[PDB]
Structures are given as C-alpha cells and as structure tokens.
C-alpha cells in the first residue's frame, strides 16, 4: 500500500519571516507567506511580510528597446499618516519603538533583533530559549536568519550582492544644505536592510556610462536617522488611497490604460558603467 522512492528536491522559501515558527512543539503554527517567496529574486522577504511590517508592496518597473526590467516597491502610507507612521523602514535606533516586539512572536522578535544587530537582545533570547526542543528551534530560526543575513551582507565577498554599482540614494534634495548622510546610515544599515532598500527604492535617475535617464523629477521618499521615511521631500504629502490588505462617469470612461494610483519609491541616482 505505502509508496515511496527517495528524498526529493523542492522549492525554497526566500523570505526571512518564513522561518517564523511557534516555539511550541505541542502547538502548531504556520506563518502567512506569499508564494512570491519562492522566486529566485533579490527579494528576501515575501510580499505579505513586507506589507505587514514595512508598509510596502513589491512592484516592477520595466525600463526600456533595451528593456532591463528592474524591481521596485511602493508606498502604503496614508496621506494623513504622520510622525512614526511615516517611517517606512525603521533604523536600528528606532526599530524597537516602531515594532511592538512585546506583542509579537518571540521568534519574530529575535529575527528583527538579528536584522538590526542588537546582539545583546539576541543573546538574551537565546539564553532564555536554551534554559527551558527549544534549542532545536533556536538552531532553526537563528541559522536561517543568519544565513540570509550573510547572503545579503553587501560589504563582503562570496555573497553575490555587490555589482560594483555606485548608486547614491543620499543624493542631495538640491535645496537642503550640505548634508545627506542617508548613505552614511546606509553604510551602518544591516546587509539585508541595505539590500531591501536597494530593491524597493528605485533610483530617480539611471546613469549608464555617459547616459542619464530621468524617471522621477522629485523623490517620493527620504532616508534619515529614523530610516526610510515615506515623506514628500517638499512638504505637502501625496495622497495615498489605501484600498485593501492591512460611477456613471467611470462607466462612460471605458478602459484607457488607466494610470495607477500608487506612489512608487523614487530616490537617488544609480551609477553603472563599463569600467
């Protein structure tokens, strides 16, 4: 009756939060992960976790005859959102404030600590989980998260991340004073954090050798000490009609390739050349 041949190879979930599992062997849990996590793309977070935690949704910008489609994310911050709500991606100095770690799974708390370093909290959690099976879950969660972090780890080799590109997403607003520092903080930003920022935020301009292509004449988001902020640089926030997740005129107006209502992420110049 029973049938079996041999061990099999299957797909791989590439989102970090897929490793989230209840620390309970007696109480099963399954994390909500979008099937997109099974695409061998730069995205190391699934659309579900991205929207849930960073308020961002994946998108593709098909730049072209020489069409080189590139990844991009878009705002999900309401127009009336303010202050901490505007921090699209928190920094290591504020992620604890932005994320209610106390109200989420301790595995998720450990994962976020790993993303934002916080090795002290990481060690505290490991000790608590060890001095109580739970050691096996320590192994699984920490190993997966650290594997992904080292994989991203743009400031190393053997990782398949650095393309020798010199994107400057700290490019000046052109009216601020001598400043920026977004790339300084980026240098400090964790490897997965930096790669997530790269993939999500498309450059305002694309610089190719002696060619500069312009895609957005005003940045849609900024980077500061708090991290990535979904704020219009020049003040009055763009309207964001949040629809899901979390008349007769139109009928007359049949399909006309209606423009999307979203606000993609545009910031910086992306510099690539033949040298």
């Amino acid at each position: 009756v029973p049938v079996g041949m041999a061990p099999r190879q299957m797909r791989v979930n590439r989102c970090i939060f897929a490793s989230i599992v209840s620390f309970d062997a007696c109480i099963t849990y399954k994390s909500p992960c979008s099937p997109d996590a099974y695409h061998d793309d730069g995205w190391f977070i699934c659309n579900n976790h991205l929207i849930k935690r960073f308020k961002m949704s994946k998108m593709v910008l098909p730049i072209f005859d020489n069409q080189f489609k590139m990844t991009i994310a878009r705002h999900l911050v309401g127009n009336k959102e303010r202050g901490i709500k505007r921090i699209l991606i928190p920094s290591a100095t504020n992620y604890q404030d932005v994320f209610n770690l106390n109200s989420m799974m301790q595995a998720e708390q450990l994962i976020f600590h790993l993303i934002y370093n916080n090795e002290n909290a990481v060690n505290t959690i490991c000790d608590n989980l060890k001095y109580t099976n739970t050691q096996r879950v320590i192994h699984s969660v920490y190993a997966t998260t650290k594997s992904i972090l080292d994989t991203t780890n743009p400031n190393t080799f053997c990782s398949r991340v650095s393309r020798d590109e010199l994107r400057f997403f700290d490019v000046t607003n052109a009216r601020a004073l001598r400043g920026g520092a977004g790339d300084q903080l980026f240098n400090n930003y964790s490897g997965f954090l930096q790669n997530l920022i790269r993939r999500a935020v498309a450059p305002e301009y694309l610089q190719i050798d002696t060619e500069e292509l312009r895609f957005r004449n005003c940045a849609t988001c900024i980077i500061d000490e708090t991290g990535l902020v979904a704020s219009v640089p020049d003040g009055p926030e763009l309207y964001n009609p949040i629809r899901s997740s979390d008349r007769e005129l139109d009928r007359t107006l049949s399909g006309y390739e209606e423009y999307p209502t979203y606000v993609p992420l545009f910031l910086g110049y992306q510099i690539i050349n033949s040298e």
Binding site: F168, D170, V171, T172, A174, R178, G179, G180, A181, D183, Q184, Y269
Partner: peptide, 17 residues
C-alpha cells in the same frame, strides 16, 4: 563619514547646476 558623502552630494549638485 562626512566628506565621503558631502563631497558626492556636491558633485551631483554641481552636475545638475
């Protein structure tokens, strides 16, 4: 670092100017 980024900011600013 300060200059490492302020100088690049200035370079792009001069380019646009």
């Amino acid at each position: 670092k300060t200059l490492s980024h302020q100088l690049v900011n200035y370079i792009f600013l001069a380019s646009n100017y």
